[PDB]
Design a protein around this ligand. Structure first.
Ligand SMILES: *[C@@H]1O[C@H](CO[C@@H]2O[C@@H](C)[C@@H](O)[C@@H](O)[C@@H]2O)[C@@H](O[C@@H]2O[C@H](CO)[C@@H](O)[C@H](O)[C@H]2NC(C)=O)[C@H](O)[C@H]1NC(C)=O
Ligand SMILES: *[C@@H]1O[C@H](CO[C@@H]2O[C@@H](C)[C@@H](O)[C@@H](O)[C@@H]2O)[C@@H](O[C@@H]2O[C@H](CO)[C@@H](O)[C@H](O)[C@H]2NC(C)=O)[C@H](O)[C@H]1NC(C)=O
Ligand SMILES: *[C@@H]1O[C@H](CO[C@@H]2O[C@@H](C)[C@@H](O)[C@@H](O)[C@@H]2O)[C@@H](O[C@@H]2O[C@H](CO)[C@@H](O)[C@H](O)[C@H]2NC(C)=O)[C@H](O)[C@H]1NC(C)=O
Ligand SMILES: *[C@@H]1O[C@H](CO[C@@H]2O[C@@H](C)[C@@H](O)[C@@H](O)[C@@H]2O)[C@@H](O[C@@H]2O[C@H](CO)[C@@H](O)[C@H](O)[C@H]2NC(C)=O)[C@H](O)[C@H]1NC(C)=O
Ligand SMILES: *[C@@H]1O[C@H](CO[C@@H]2O[C@@H](C)[C@@H](O)[C@@H](O)[C@@H]2O)[C@@H](O[C@@H]2O[C@H](CO)[C@@H](O)[C@H](O)[C@H]2NC(C)=O)[C@H](O)[C@H]1NC(C)=O
Ligand SMILES: *[C@@H]1O[C@H](CO[C@@H]2O[C@@H](C)[C@@H](O)[C@@H](O)[C@@H]2O)[C@@H](O[C@@H]2O[C@H](CO)[C@@H](O)[C@H](O)[C@H]2NC(C)=O)[C@H](O)[C@H]1NC(C)=O
Ligand SMILES: *[C@@H]1O[C@H](CO[C@@H]2O[C@@H](C)[C@@H](O)[C@@H](O)[C@@H]2O)[C@@H](O[C@@H]2O[C@H](CO)[C@@H](O)[C@H](O)[C@H]2NC(C)=O)[C@H](O)[C@H]1NC(C)=O
Ligand SMILES: *[C@@H]1O[C@H](CO[C@@H]2O[C@@H](C)[C@@H](O)[C@@H](O)[C@@H]2O)[C@@H](O[C@@H]2O[C@H](CO)[C@@H](O)[C@H](O)[C@H]2NC(C)=O)[C@H](O)[C@H]1NC(C)=O
Ligand SMILES: CCC(CC)O[C@@H]1C=C(C(=O)O)C[C@H](N)[C@H]1NC(C)=O
Ligand SMILES: CCC(CC)O[C@@H]1C=C(C(=O)O)C[C@H](N)[C@H]1NC(C)=O
Ligand SMILES: CCC(CC)O[C@@H]1C=C(C(=O)O)C[C@H](N)[C@H]1NC(C)=O
Ligand SMILES: CCC(CC)O[C@@H]1C=C(C(=O)O)C[C@H](N)[C@H]1NC(C)=O
Ligand SMILES: [Ca+2]
Ligand SMILES: [Ca+2]
Ligand SMILES: [Ca+2]
Ligand SMILES: [Ca+2]
Ligand SMILES: [Ca+2]
Lengths: 387, 387, 387, 387
């Protein structure tokens, strides 16, 4: 098997429903593992669901309080795409309360952070063997993407951060080849001010669209190759895509955060398309409910012509959403753009009267065809669930 | 692996019991996924069960009301043939409330419809990647076979419908090659008036025997190759095979619906054999109970000589049945004809006093040997089941 | 892969504990499928457990009354050797209330009987496809070995019976090659009078040691090759091995049933070793409790020198046993002799106060080393079990 | 595939968290198999968890009393590394109440002891076939490592013991090639006095660090090749690593047990590194709580310079630990040193108010990087568990 190449994105004009796991509905009888921060990544044979498990089954007493982000009992797990994660189908990849995974064409790489907040380490797993590690250098929650990394010609690129969420953190990119760290770079801060939870894809180069958790309702981004960071900015679109954010239309800021509705943000994604941009976002401008994707004409560039040419509403605003991220699927000579949406149920969502916090997953892929319309929310009646 | 070829059907003179999943009996302790619209399809290594799941486990609170046909929580799932579908053995193929699948000799293709009734889309999956789609053009429940499609020399043929169930719908056939739509045809309406839920097999050409849900107690059919629709009609047999239908013997109508007991019909199948025809049917002429298969001498043609030369009663009329469909299994130089029967339990069946609707499966294959006799119903005591 | 050859048995002087599933103990929480008539058979990569499931989970309401031998809800299932059969690990091989399976070196063959007592049929499955069938010719419980068949140079040999248990049945051997029946023979009745449930192995030729269910406390046997039945008799050993049977020592009858304690018998096995014989048997001479294996000096022949040179007590007489059968495992240039013991719990066993009937499995293999001693019974406390 | 070679250990300076199964937390709803004596061993494709199951699910009535070491209902089972062992994911390797496993580069070998205390036998399994056996020669609990054996150039080396725990036992090493016993040696007793439960790894030669259960708070060790035992001793380190043991610093004894706090000991491990040594140990000097690993400068040799240069506290002393053992993972031209820690919950641990005894697993691997810090205990709230 050859290493994955720097292919362009395939043509696309809309997104179509792919896999949906209905994990919460299916967990009513306590079979399903509690998770959050799911994502999808594919190898030569299959696409897979990944998520950070909580070391408990949904609805059991050990699931109470799983809103807590970091415990020693969290592992990155893998399970068949669109299935609910159960003890009979999951694989445990590594101990982790923050993770990223990607397939380089030959083998899987994983980046797994765990340990004390002030002294975490990232374990690099390659072909199932622990091959390298990163030591916390700022001693404040060493952490990574919570979605797939990207590999070009054998070199994998992954965003890694350490330092105070809310006090000037060090955002880095690491380059890793066959499980061995080659180099890192500190992300330039000339434009980007805050850069959490990058969602990345390949379109010749690696593009990452991330979360400014402090000052920007518009999303920061970077373009990277197998050698270096090439470009940075914020998405120009006057239609912002973080949560919270101002109502449409807002300000155009290509080089700085909007400086309004800046935090806390939510992990999200987008796809540059020529001078245009596709952006996922919650339907709500204030909370993690609903999900839509918009295409903004000339939204990647400084332009008077920003318009939402397409709006697909995929999860209604009467339903909970959560994180979202990009993944790619190799076509023949291009990469198809896809994404997942985390559908968070439980704490702290209003009226989800249970003690646990978990999610289900829904996914969509891009085609060069016109889409229809529908609604694919979590679908659980929370009143039916063990608390 | 070569693409599957236009092989003839193998010789056969009776049908024999193959796999049975006993899924409802085995679901008494809430392990089994709620399904309906099952079917079977085989690749080079295995035959598989497929079905439209309901995103709930049988007997849980989320299973209440699963008589409802179309929700966002339905997915096409696959599980080992003759096993009950459980979280530990299933795979999720795609989001779908209507589906068809077929193996072309190299890879699996799936056709998956989901979304709003007035704007559904069909996703085409090939080798696990979403490769194409069909947009609803009549805006009224875009839908497909609920059994296996057929592929000849790399081109797969699948029946797709859009438009009012009960007001003149557009019935089409699509030709799809390596996941890419090549062309479609509108089914000629010179003979066929209504054409739902086609059950297809290969005997050199593709033959489909379908469901007229409005005017015909006799079944409509078409013959198709890798290029075009070759022939259409209704099954000539004066012994009708839809449900409801007149008592035997009825009218011979080769070119039009019987115009009696026309609706609602049920998905079913048959096999042309020379000038004869094998037809599956419920034992009841009014409801979905029992299952038998008959061979009608000269039943494919206009003839004074129609007689039921063979009647195999496979599920007694004291037991519930449901949909049935054909599948083929490659022999060496011919295809063996097989079929499945959906055994529906729960709503709306009289005295199935539970709130859910699901099914089990039983299957039979044709051999050129004389069969014995037996009875292979669902077998659940509904009074034992969680409601 | 070449077809399996007519290899001799490897040298052996004792039997050693191999795999044990503890299926009843592990089924206390209703996870385990109800079974009986288990056996073991191996391919090039793995040994497997097989059994006739009852289409219900142990301890559920549908498990009540599973003492009943023949229902439409029984299937031959396969699961990893030494594991308990659960919905998450089993495969359904075919619908069956009597079965045999064997691997020919290239593919698995199965023989599966099901249907009405007076019109059953045997389906022959080869490489997963139904390839042939046998129609009941005596119309009285067409039935087979309940343990592995044997294949030599591509031709598989399997014992098949039809006709009154207790009124002169037709015992046959069938020869089947790549799933196609080649020929059958009626077993000669010059010596053998009753021949049920043969346990067979290969030692150059096929040897089968069976159950006379009417007149013989000594076991009937036959020797078969890829062409014909070569020899028949009853095991000469004055130490009998069916259940019930006379206390040791009893009569030597090489050519006829003992004519004492003849019925009902139990499926069992043995291994000829030169002029000696190894025989498995219950410890009790009256009921299905305990299990031991004995080696009888010159026990295969008419001789004044019969002595039990070895007695291994493997399941104590305070514990329930059941059926037992031989299987072989290819060494390099010989076959290793192994066997399984069915450990039946539930009805009708005295003080097993539950409504169901099921079993666990324990297995042993022969080595040319001296064995130790132990006890490997089912081990369930029946009072802990759901009834 | 070539046989595994005598590679050196890779460079390492700290240990990093790898896989963690959280098996007790995940067993709250009675899905998980009761185990103890877990270990890890890897083949060319995967690392695996192994353990001695108890033939019962955790929290069921059959789990009551599983503190008992030896029953016929114990089997060596295998399950994916870092997953909880459940009926849907486990494989049963052999009947065993003591075991060792190792992969030789081509196939798995297992050593499985079972049977009566006074007449046990060890079954040798190779490529899934039982190929040889060892008969108890001292008639007193024939037993083995409870962690992975080691194979060099096709010859596997395994420590096997028979005779009174507390009255002069025979400690042996066996050499086994493709499942056939080649030879054994009696371990020299010139230095070693007691040698139980060896934890072994490869660093050119095989090194084993074991448990003196009678006289030594320091650990006995041996160095072995494919032919013979090369060297024996006790670990020189004045910082002892068995449990119980004296507080640091204690005595330096390279050639004899410390003769203080000698019993009962606990299975543990270490890694020689030049003249230095890494030693795992409980945090407590009296009981099985906590886990740390220390590196002792010149700790392998007689030296005035013993100092703990590194102490990693991996499980706090407020949490239960248990057995620990080494395993290796092939890098390219060296073996990476790794280890597991058994986290025992239930009887007889103070305040674990349940009737059963089981464990979870956590694992760590060595890298030539500086580690961070954390805590990875079992994590179950025992008050939440079925008793
Ligand atoms: C990085 O990969 C390049 C090849 O990729 C091209 O250049 C990248 C920087 C990026 O722009 C991609 O989109 C381009 O496709 C490697 O360049 C090769 O280098 C080798 C060794 O010097 C040389 O023999 C080849 O000519 C180069 N190949 C091409 C097509 O230019 C480069 O080695 C990689 N760098 C690292 C640090 O891994
Ligand atoms: C979810 O858990 C809370 C907290 O549980 C308590 O603290 C935990 C860490 C653990 O120690 C538990 O055993 C404790 O009970 C539950 O709230 C508690 O409920 C109990 C019993 O009703 C009550 O006595 C305590 O005062 C409560 N503690 C607090 C701080 O509220 C809560 O009930 C659990 N939710 C569900 C649905 O079970
Ligand atoms: C459709 O397949 C044919 C081959 O199948 C034959 O013709 C079909 C229409 C149908 O009648 C089958 O049962 C027949 O077996 C393809 O015909 C080939 O075309 C290529 C390219 O022109 C030519 O080189 C070969 O001679 C043809 N092969 C044969 C045996 O005639 C045809 O290309 C297919 N059409 C499409 C649109 O895919
Ligand atoms: C199956 O469900 C019905 C309907 O449940 C109600 O509506 C659902 C959409 C959901 O909102 C439920 O929580 C509602 O209860 C059940 O019928 C209801 O039963 C409840 C309690 O007995 C009663 O208060 C309501 O009036 C009933 N509603 C109607 C319209 O009949 C029914 O009991 C369920 N069946 C089973 C076996 O549980
Ligand atoms: C049955 O197999 C034989 C080969 O097996 C040998 O003969 C058997 C009857 C039995 O005694 C075995 O243990 C022996 O090992 C086949 O004999 C071959 O026949 C072919 C074709 O005629 C011939 O070319 C070979 O010489 C034969 N091989 C040998 C070694 O004799 C025979 O064909 C098989 N019969 C059937 C009906 O399948
Ligand atoms: C095992 O089942 C028997 C029989 O159950 C009855 O007949 C079955 C075919 C089915 O129709 C059941 O629903 C019937 O109840 C049970 O014995 C019956 O128990 C019920 C309730 O106590 C009693 O009313 C009947 O008279 C009994 N029938 C007979 C013939 O004895 C038995 O209790 C079941 N065992 C267990 C452990 O549940
Ligand atoms: C044991 O293996 C040796 C090869 O391993 C080397 O010697 C060992 C004793 C040990 O020191 C290892 O670390 C060394 O790497 C085998 O030696 C071979 O023997 C064959 C046959 O005599 C001979 O042709 C080769 O020259 C030897 N190879 C080398 C490199 O010396 C030896 O056969 C093994 N012994 C047994 C009993 O299996
Ligand atoms: C764990 O089991 C003990 C012992 O159970 C008894 O002995 C077993 C071998 C088996 O025969 C059981 O059926 C017996 O009950 C339990 O202690 C017993 O509890 C019962 C009921 O409360 C009491 O009548 C006995 O006197 C107790 N026996 C002893 C020796 O203490 C214990 O309760 C079980 N623990 C749990 C959590 O269920
Ligand atoms: C610690 C910073 C980080 C990004 C802002 O916080 C996160 C936000 C979360 C959220 O906004 O939902 C949940 C995450 N599990 C989390 N990451 C970790 C490692 O705890
Ligand atoms: C919508 C038309 C169609 C065929 C007549 O109706 C069906 C009949 C059904 C039935 O007669 O049982 C159940 C089906 N799930 C259904 N199809 C969909 C897509 O809802
Ligand atoms: C029908 C004759 C046959 C052999 C004597 O009876 C059997 C004896 C049985 C027994 O003695 O336990 C159980 C079997 N399941 C059975 N076989 C069938 C097909 O019902
Ligand atoms: C019998 C001697 C042996 C080593 C000291 O005892 C063990 C100690 C144990 C322990 O100290 O936890 C548990 C073990 N399961 C055991 N081994 C067997 C075979 O019973
Ligand atoms: Ca923000
Ligand atoms: Ca009709
Ligand atoms: Ca008898
Ligand atoms: Ca359960
Ligand atoms: Ca000690």
């Amino acid at each position: 098997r050859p290493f994955k190449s720097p292919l362009p994105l395939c043509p696309f004009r809309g997104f179509f429903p792919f896999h949906k796991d209905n994990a919460i509905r299916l967990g009513e009888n306590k079979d399903v593992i509690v998770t959050r921060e799911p994502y999808v990544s594919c190898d030569n044979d299959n696409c897979w669901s990944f998520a950070l498990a909580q070391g408990a089954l949904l609805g059991t007493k050990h699931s109470n309080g799983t809103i807590k982000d970091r415990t020693p009992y969290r592992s990155l797990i893998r399970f068949p795409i669109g299935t609910a994660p159960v003890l009979g189908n999951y694989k445990e990849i590594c101990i982790a309360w923050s993770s990223s995974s990607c397939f380089d064409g030959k083998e899987w790489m994983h980046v797994c952070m765990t340990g004390n907040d002030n002294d975490a380490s990232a374990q690099i797993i390659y072909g199932g063997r622990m091959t390298d590690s990163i030591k916390s250098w700022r001693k404040d929650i060493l952490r990574t993407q919570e979605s797939e990394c990207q590999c070009i010609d054998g070199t994998c690129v992954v965003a890694v951060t350490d330092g105070p969420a809310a006090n000037s953190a060090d955002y880095r990119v690491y380059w890793i080849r066959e499980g061995k760290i080659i180099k890192y770079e500190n992300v330039p801060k000339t434009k980007i001010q805050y850069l959490e939870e990058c969602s990345c894809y390949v379109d010749i180069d690696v593009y990452c669209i991330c979360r400014d958790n402090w000052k920007g309702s518009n999303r920061p981004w970077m373009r990277i190759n197998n050698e270096t960071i090439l470009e940075t900015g914020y998405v120009c679109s006057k239609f912002h895509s973080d949560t919270p954010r101002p109502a449409d239309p807002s300000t155009m800021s290509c080089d700085s955060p909007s400086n309004v509705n800046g935090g806390p943000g939510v992990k999200g994604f987008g796809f540059k398309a020529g001078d245009d941009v596709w952006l996922g976002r919650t339907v709500s401008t204030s909370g993690r409910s609903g999900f839509e994707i918009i295409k903004v004409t000339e939204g990647w560039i400084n332009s008077p012509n920003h318009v939402k040419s397409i709006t697909q509403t995929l999860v209604s605003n009467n339903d909970w959403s959560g994180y979202s991220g990009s993944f790619i699927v190799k076509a023949k000579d291009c990469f198809q753009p896809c994404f997942y949406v985390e559908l968070i149920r439980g704490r702290p969502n209003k009226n989800d009267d249970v003690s646990w916090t978990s999610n289900s997953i829904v996914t969509f892929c891009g085609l060069d065809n016109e889409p229809g319309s529908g609604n694919w929310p979590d679908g659980s009646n929370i009143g039916f669930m063990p608390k």
